[PDB]
Amino acid sequence: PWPASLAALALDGKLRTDSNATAAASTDFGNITSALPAAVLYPSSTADLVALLSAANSTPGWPYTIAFRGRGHSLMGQAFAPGGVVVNMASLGDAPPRINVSADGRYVDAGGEQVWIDVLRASLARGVAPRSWTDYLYLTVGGTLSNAGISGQAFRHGPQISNVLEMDVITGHGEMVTCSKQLNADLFDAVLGGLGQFGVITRARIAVEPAPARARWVRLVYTDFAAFSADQERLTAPRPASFGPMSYVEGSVFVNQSLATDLANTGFFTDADVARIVALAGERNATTVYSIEATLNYDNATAAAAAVDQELASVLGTLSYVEGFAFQRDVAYAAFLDRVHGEEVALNKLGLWRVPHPWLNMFVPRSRIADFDRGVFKGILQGTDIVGPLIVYPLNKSMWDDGMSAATPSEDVFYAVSLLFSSVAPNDLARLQEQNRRILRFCDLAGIQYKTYAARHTDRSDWVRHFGAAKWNRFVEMKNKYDPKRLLSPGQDIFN
Ligand SMILES: *Cc1cc2c(cc1C)nc1c(=O)[nH]c(=O)nc-1n2C[C@H](O)[C@H](O)[C@H](O)COP(=O)(O)OP(=O)(O)OC[C@H]1O[C@@H](n2cnc3c(N)ncnc32)[C@H](O)[C@@H]1O
Ligand SMILES: *[C@@H]1O[C@H](CO)[C@@H](O[C@@H]2O[C@H](CO)[C@@H](O)[C@H](O)[C@H]2NC(C)=O)[C@H](O)[C@H]1NC(C)=O
Ligand SMILES: *[C@@H]1O[C@H](CO)[C@@H](O[C@@H]2O[C@H](CO)[C@@H](O)[C@H](O)[C@H]2NC(C)=O)[C@H](O)[C@H]1NC(C)=O
Ligand SMILES: O=C(Nc1ccccc1)Nc1ccnc(Cl)c1
Ligand SMILES: *[C@@H]1O[C@H](CO)[C@@H](O)[C@H](O)[C@H]1NC(C)=O
Ligand SMILES: *[C@@H]1O[C@H](CO)[C@@H](O)[C@H](O)[C@H]1NC(C)=O
């Protein structure tokens, strides 16, 4: 038996079972696992989501799990609802306006379904921009907020979950709830890094700053991991006040075997730069090369170019990169922020949405990052052909709210480590998946207390270890309060 509001969605053609709809919602960016849903919902307003979830809560024996597909950027089926209902969130963006910049210019309201690129465009039109980003802008507000949302700005602003004033969340009961640190703080905390377990974000209120016009964009080259890591930490350390001048700090690892090809494929270095770095590696007999990637944001002011030149020259003077290996670009701010989709349209060397992506993303405590470098970059990854960036950069724990669902290492400094392998042949995929297990096995045996990011575990004890036992208890508490029927985002494999 169906409720009247639920059947209306089927009547309006919003709830679909055709092979076209179900197929499109059965694969994801990872391109490794697939799972057909029974149906796909295309909501025209938030009321349609209320209707679906109210029906689910007020129908005994309801057998259909529900997932909220943003853009399906998930790597291992986290956005699937096997034999259930997948919500095509983007359908919410098809009047009223889905992105509302505040009157006072302090925040931007965006629909959970909206992709960050559009949030950026609407913000820039009104002279503002969010402060904390992801590397890739074609992800959804609600998708990144269910994880954390990390990029090179997070060391100073925290992850994207640390830059949300409030949210509208339709809970697993079918109830629209507005939440913040004040009103319904428990739900607010649960949903942020919550892996879609407690409800769907329909609106997020995102902190903004005045929009810079340009980014001075620099790469610094190292052959010594100790110098590389020390300088990253120097650039990201809190002052004896706030954080230094840098707007963004990330880093890259280049393995010797494919050094020239990989440097050239950054889209940053010229062929002249590449030849010099390759020569440097040969001179130092390096099996690995490291590059800090950093920016300084500034405006159109006439002095700004000179002020940034002085600020940068000052900053660079404290660093220990190989003398003469500072490489400098200057681009529009939006161009920098959208660099990754920029490459996707340009070349798509990584076969985004085209080939399998057995990506490994994790947080590594600072005290063990040198061991990780030895065991992985100078160990496991040596003598292999790698297609895809190896990104390494430190984060400050102080800018993370451990009350929120997202799990991080306990140390004050930890590194985002993103091994973004793209698979060609099928034997490459199995090799890469094995290599990922081998990396995690290494860390386990070495006693490295890492946390995975944007990964799903298939074992209960693994999820318990992931959150920590005490934090796990409050995760289950929130699951019982907000999704007692355990229908939401089953692809995370936490309660399903
Ligand atoms: C594909 C990819 C992903 C990516 C990235 C680059 C690429 C090419 N760069 C990232 C980065 O620099 N920093 C970062 O933190 N993440 C980066 N990502 C990973 C990305 O965050 C995840 O893929 C994430 O899942 C967001 O992607 P998407 O918006 O497409 O969300 P999804 O995969 O469909 O769903 C993920 C889970 O969240 C639940 N969900 C989705 N929307 C909502 C809303 N609105 N409310 C509540 N829950 C939601 C889904 O149910 C699913 O479980
Ligand atoms: C952006 O603002 C518009 C209008 O300023 C909001 O539209 C309202 O939406 C609510 C809920 O759907 C309706 O009850 C009102 O009738 C709408 N008002 C108007 C004037 O259209 C919209 O909710 C805002 N969007 C976000 C994401 O915050
Ligand atoms: C880095 O990789 C390059 C290329 O794979 C290595 O250069 C090769 O060295 C072997 C000797 O073992 C020669 O037989 C090849 O002709 C070289 N190839 C090229 C393209 O120059 C280099 O030895 C490696 N360096 C380190 C430190 O591992
Ligand atoms: O993809 C990323 N960065 C990226 C991708 C392509 C080109 C340059 C950077 N980063 C990233 C960070 C955290 N989780 C995930 Cl799944 C991915
Ligand atoms: C991966 O993508 C390819 C090409 O688009 C497709 O043929 C295949 O079904 C996909 N596999 C999975 C597991 O999604
Ligand atoms: C160069 O490095 C390799 C691998 O790290 C090492 O085996 C070799 O001894 C080094 N060569 C010299 C001359 O130091």
The domain made up of 214-453 has a fold known as Vanillyl-alcohol Oxidase; Chain A, domain 3 (3.40.462)
Residue 423 has which token pair? 């698979």
What is d(CA 463, CA 144) in angstroms, rounded to the nearest whole number?
A: 19
Q: Please give the C-alpha separations between residue 323 and each of 51, 169, 228, 426, in angstroms, as whole numbers.
A: 63, 52, 13, 43
What is d(CA 30, CA 26) in angstroms, rounded to the nearest whole number?
A: 12
Sign of the four-CA dihedral 47, 39, 458, 372: negative
- Residue 297 CB partners (closer than 8 Å, separation 6+): 212, 214, 215, 216, 247, 248, 333
Closest-lying ligand 3 atom to the alpha carbon of residue 257 = 2
Q: What is the 3-state secondary structure (H, E, C) of the chain?
A: CCCHHHHHHHHCCCEECCHHHHHHCCCCCCCCCCCCCCEEECCCCHHHHHHHHHHHHCCCCCCCCEEEECCCCCCCCCCCCCCCEEEEHHHHHCCCCCEEECCCCCEEEEECCCEHHHHHHHHHHCCEEECCCCCCCCCEHHHHHCCCCCCCCHHHHCCHHHCEEEEEEEECCCCEEEEECCCCHHHHHHHCCCCCCCEEEEEEEEEEEECCCEEEEEEEEECCHHHHHHHHHHHHCECCCCECCCCEEEEEEEEHHHHHHHHHCCCCCCHHHHHHHHHHHHHHCCCEEEEEEEEEEECCCCCHHHHHHHHHHHHHCCCCCCCCCEEEEEEEHHHHHCHHHHHHHHCCCCCCCCCCCCCEEEEEEHHHHHHHHHHHHHHHCCCCCCCCCEEEEEEEHHHCCCCCCCCCCCCCEEEEEEECCCCCCHHHHHHHHHHHHHHHHHHHHHCCCCEECCCCCCCHHHHHHHHCHHHHHHHHHHHHHHCCCCCECHHHCCCC
CA of residue 434 to ligand 5 center, whole Å: 20
Residue 94 has which token pair? 């098809």
Ligand 4 contact, 295 CB (< 6 A): no
The CATH number corresponding to 1-88+454-496 among 3.30.450.20, 1.10.10.10, 3.10.129.10, 3.30.43.10 equals: 3.30.43.10
Which residue type occupies 316? L
CA of residue 31 to ligand 5 center, whole Å: 5
Domain residue spans of the chain? 1-88+454-496, 89-213, 214-453
User: Considering only CA atoms, which residue is closest to atom 15 of ligand 2?
Assistant: 96
What is d(CA 444, CA 287) in angstroms, rounded to the nearest whole number?
A: 24
Name the residue of 22, 27, 433 whose CB sits within 8 Å of the most ligand 5 atoms, as the mutation to test its pocket. Answer: 27
Question: Please, what is the angle between helix 46-57 and helix 4-11, to 10°?
Answer: 130
Binding residue positions for FAD: 68, 70-72, 74, 78, 135, 140, 146, 150, 201, 453, 489, 492
Residue 375 has which token pair? 């065991």
User: Considering only CA atoms, which residue is closest to atom 17 of ligand 4?
Assistant: 418
357 catalytically annotated: no
Binding residue positions for trans-zeatin: 135, 343, 418
- Among 155, 48, 172, smallest CA distance to 408 is for 155
CA of residue 419 to ligand 4 center, whole Å: 8
Breaks in the chain follow which residues, C to N over 2.5 Å?
94, 240
Resolution in A: 1.9
What is d(CA 261, CA 328) in angstroms, rounded to the nearest whole number?
A: 20
Which is the catalytic residue, given 48, 73, 373, 466? 73
250 catalytically annotated: yes
- Among 370, 275, 287, 380, smallest CA distance to 327 is for 275
User: Considering only CA atoms, which residue is closest to atom 6 of ligand 3?
Assistant: 257
Evaluate whether 131 touches 159 at the Cβ level (below 8 Å): no
Binding residue positions for N(6)-dimethylallyladenine: 135, 343
What is d(CA 66, CA 39) in angstroms, rounded to the nearest whole number?
A: 10
Evaluate whether 206 touches 110 at the Cβ level (below 8 Å): yes
| Other Cβ atoms closer than 10 A to 443 | 18
- Beta strands 66-69 and 85-88, pairing class: parallel
Residue in the block written with tokens 């793209």: 422
Ligand 1 contact, 147 CB (< 6 A): yes
Q: Alpha-carbon Rg of the chain, whole angstroms?
A: 23
| Other Cβ atoms closer than 10 A to 173 | 17
What is d(CA 366, CA 409) in angstroms, rounded to the nearest whole number?
A: 9
295: left (phi over 0), alpha (psi -120 to 50) or beta: beta
Residue 347 has which token pair? 């070349």
Ligand 4 contact, 136 CB (< 6 A): yes
Which is the catalytic residue, given 250, 262, 338, 493? 250
Sign of the four-CA dihedral 75, 83, 462, 233: positive
User: Edge-to-edge strand order for the sheet containing 85-88?
Assistant: 15-16, 39-41, 85-88, 66-69
Query: Which phi and psi (to 5°) does residue 441 adopt?
Result: -60, -45
Closest-lying ligand 3 atom to the alpha carbon of residue 382 = 28
- Beta strands 413-419 and 390-396, pairing class: antiparallel
What is d(CA 475, CA 466) in angstroms, rounded to the nearest whole number?
A: 11
What is d(CA 256, CA 320) in angstroms, rounded to the nearest whole number?
A: 21
Q: How many CA atoms lie within 13 A of 36 on its CB side?
A: 9
CA of residue 304 to ligand 1 center, whole Å: 36
> Could you say which architecture CATH assigns to the domain 89-213?
2-Layer Sandwich (3.30)
- Among 147, 163, 180, 173, smallest CA distance to 405 is for 147
| Other Cβ atoms closer than 10 A to 300 | 9
What is d(CA 301, CA 171) in angstroms, rounded to the nearest whole number?
A: 47
User: Considering only CA atoms, which residue is closest to atom 6 of ligand 2?
Assistant: 96
- Among 391, 393, 385, 389, smallest CA distance to 435 is for 385
Say how far residue 331 (Cα) sits from the centre of its chain: 23
What is d(CA 145, CA 74) in angstroms, rounded to the nearest whole number?
A: 13
Evaluate whether 415 touches 364 at the Cβ level (below 8 Å): yes
311 catalytically annotated: no
Residue 491 has which token pair? 């692809």
User: Considering only CA atoms, which residue is closest to atom 5 of ligand 5?
Assistant: 354
According to DSSP, the residues that pair with 264 across neighbouring strands are: none
Closest-lying ligand 2 atom to the alpha carbon of residue 109 = 28
Cis before 238? omega within 30: no
